[PDB]
C-alpha cells in the first residue's frame, strides 16, 4: 500500500505549502497567479526547510497558490481549518479517492489532461464566483501534484456535497438524458444507492416541490452555471441531489403528500475537455437545465 | 470640421449599441465577452434598423459590449443616464478630445495599439474591480470605433476626475520622477494650471495631511493599483490630484496651517504598451507609490 505513502506526502506537502503561505502577507489575485506552479522537495533524509519521513523521497507541486488562497477564503475555508481537516487527521480511502476524517473535504486524483484543463479554467471560475455567489459548481480548494519515484499523482481538493454529518435517504445523479440511466443492480443493492434519471422519473413522478421564492433562484443560478459550462465546452456533468426527509445548511423542499424535507444539490464531473459538434455542449446544457427545472423541481 | 460629423456618428451609434443592449436580457460576463467586437452600419441613406443622417456613411464598431455593460453597472452608471449624458446633449471639444455637456464623461481618441492593448487588459481590469472597490485607475465605460471614409477613429469613454461641478484651485500631475517635471511657462499662465512634481515639491513642501484612518486606505489601494499596473508592464502613468480648499464626493484633507480642504485623485495614462528592462515597470511603480505615499500625502 503506497496509498499510505501518498496520504503522507499529501498531508506533509500541503502543510508546507499553505503553512508557508499564511506567513506571507495577503494580496489580490492577478491573471498571472493562475499560471503559477510552485514545487518543493521533500527528501526522506529531511532538509533545511523539510522534515524527514518514512515515505520515499518526493517533490510536492502546488498549482496556482494565491488563486486557491483566494478561492478558499471566498468559500469560508479558514487556513487553519483547512490545514487541520486535511493534514492533522487521518485521510480515508474509497472506491484514487480520499476523504478527511471530518468528512468535509474530498481528494480525487485526476489525469494530467483534467488537471491542465482545470488550470485553464481558473479565470472563468473566478469570474463565476464573483457574479454568482449561489453557483452549484464544484468548490475547488486546491490543485497539487506529488512527484514520487517518477510518477505524477495529481490531485484536486474539493468539497464533499454529502457529508456523513447529515444522513441522506436518497441519492440521485441527474443529467437530463435517458440511455442507460438506471442504477445498476449492483448499485441498486447498496445502502442508500445513487439512482439515475430513469430511476428518478418512476420513483418520484410527482417530482420535488419548492416555494415560488426558493425555486426561481435555483432556476436562475442553474441557467447561469450552464451558460458558464457550455462556454467552456464541457459536457457529461451531472446534478447530484441528496434528499433528507425530515423528522441545517440546505434547501427546504416539500413532498407529494409527504413530510417536509431538505435537499442538498450541486454539479459534478465538470473537467471534461472538449468528435462532437460545436453546437453540442450548448445542447447538453439546455437539456440538463430544462430537465432539472421542469421534471426534478417544480413550483 | 468633420469634428461635428464624428460627434454625430458617436452619439448616433452609441444609442443604437447601448439602446439595443438594454432591451436584451441581462447575464453574467464570460471570458468570451472580452474579445467580442460588434459592428453596425449607418448609411446616410438610412436603413431598416438605421436612421439617415447628414454625416457621410459609416460603420460603428462597439468593443466588448457585455463587458462594459457590466463595468458601467459596477460604477453606478445607469444606462439611460449614460445615454442621455452622451447622446442627447451636445459634445464638447478640447485640446481628439470631447466632454459631455454635463461634464461627467470624457471621450479621448486612441491609437489602434492603445485600443487593442485595452482589449487585452479587460480581464485584469475585471479582476481589479471585484477585489479593490476603491481602485483609482481610469473608469472605462466603453470602447468604440467609427469607420468613416476609410479611417478608423477609435474612442474610449471614461470618467472625468475633475468636473466643472466642483471648482478646483490646484491641479497636480504626479509621477515620482523629477526630470522636466515643471509646469511649462505656457502652462504656468493658465487659469488653474496643472503643475508637476518639481512644482508640488516647492509650492506644497509640508505636503497634504490626512487622518490616520483616511490615509492607510489610500496607501493600501495604491499599493494595489500599482501591483496591478506593473503586472501589466505599464509605465508613465501619473497621479492626478485636484485640490479644493474649503469655505461632496471626495477625500477630506487638512493643510499646513490651512483651511480644511477636499482632494480628488486618480491614476491616468495607463494605456502604455510594454527597450526597457523586465524589472523596470516594477521600479516605476515602487517609486510612484512611495512618493505619493510619503511626499504628497502624510499622516
Q: What oligomeric arrangement do these chains adopt?
A: homodimer
Q: How far do the termini of chain A sit from each other?
A: 51 Å
How does the overall form of chain A come out from the CA principal axes?
Answer: globular
CATH architecture of the largest domain in chain A: 2-Layer Sandwich
Tally the structural domains of chain A: 2
Radius of gyration of chain A: 20 Å
User: Which sheet architecture does the biggest sheet of chain A show?
Assistant: 5 strands, antiparallel
Number of helical elements of chain A: 9
Report the β-strand fraction of chain A as a percent range.
15-25%
Number of strands of chain A: 12
Task: Quote the CATH topology of the largest domain in chain A.
Answer: Phosphatidylinositol Phosphate Kinase II Beta
Report the CATH C-level class of the largest domain in chain A: Alpha Beta
CATH superfamily of the largest domain in chain A: Phosphatidylinositol Phosphate Kinase II Beta
Helix and strand element order of chain A: HHEEHHEEEHEEEHEHHEEEH
Helix content of chain A: 25-40%
The assigned structural class of chain A equals alpha+beta
EC number (chains A, B): 2.7.1.68
GO cellular component, one term (chains A, B): cytoplasm
Keywords (chains A, B): ATP-binding, Calcium, Cytoplasm, Kinase, Metal-binding, Nucleotide-binding, Transferase
Subcellular location (chains A, B): Cytoplasm
Amino acid at each position: 500500500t503506497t496509498s499510505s505513502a501518498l496520504k503522507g506526502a499529501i498531508q506533509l506537502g500541503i502543510t508546507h505549502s499553505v503553512g508557508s503561505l499564511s506567513q506571507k502577507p495577503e494580496r489580490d489575485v492577478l491573471m498571472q497567479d493562475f499560471e503559477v506552479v510552485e514545487s518543493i522537495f521533500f527528501p526522506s533524509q529531511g532538509s533545511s526547510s523539510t522534515p524527514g519521513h518514512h515515505h520515499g523521497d518526493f517533490k510536492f507541486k502546488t498549482y496556482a497558490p494565491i488563486a486557491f488562497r483566494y478561492f478558499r477564503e471566498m468559500f469560508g475555508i479558514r487556513p487553519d481549518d483547512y490545514l487541520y481537516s486535511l493534514c492533522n487527521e487521518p485521510l480515508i480511502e474509497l472506491s484514487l479517492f480520499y476523504v478527511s476524517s471530518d468528512d468535509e473535504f474530498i481528494i480525487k486524483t485526476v489525469q494530467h489532461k483534467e488537471a491542465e484543463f482545470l488550470q485553464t479554467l481558473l479565470p472563468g471560475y473566478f469570474m463565476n464566483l464573483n457574479q454568482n455567489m449561489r453557483t452549484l459548481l464544484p468548490k475547488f480548494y486546491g490543485l497539487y501534484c506529488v512527484q514520487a519515484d517518477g510518477k505524477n499523482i495529481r490531485i484536486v481538493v474539493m468539497n464533499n456535497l454529502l457529508p456523513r454529518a447529515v444522513p441522506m435517504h436518497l441519492k440521485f445523479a441527474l443529467k437530463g438524458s435517458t440511455y442507460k440511466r438506471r442504477a445498476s443492480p449492483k448499485e441498486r443493492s447498496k445502502g442508500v444507492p445513487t439512482y439515475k434519471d430513469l430511476d428518478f422519473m418512476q420513483d418520484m413522478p410527482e417530482g420535488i416541490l419548492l416555494e415560488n421564492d426558493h425555486y426561481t433562484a435555483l432556476s436562475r443560478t442553474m441557467q447561469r452555471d450552464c451558460r458558464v459550462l457550455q462556454s467552456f465546452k464541457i459536457m457529461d456533468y451531472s446534478l447530484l441531489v441528496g434528499i433528507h426527509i425530515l423528522h441545517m445548511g440546505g434547501i427546504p423542499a416539500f413532498n407529494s403528500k409527504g413530510e417536509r424535507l431538505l435537499v442538498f444539490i450541486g454539479i459534478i464531473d465538470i473537467l471534461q475537455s472538449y468528435t462532437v459538434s460545436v453546437h453540442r455542449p450548448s445542447f447538453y446544457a439546455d437539456r440538463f437545465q430544462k430537465f432539472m427545472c421542469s421534471t426534478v423541481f417544480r413550483k
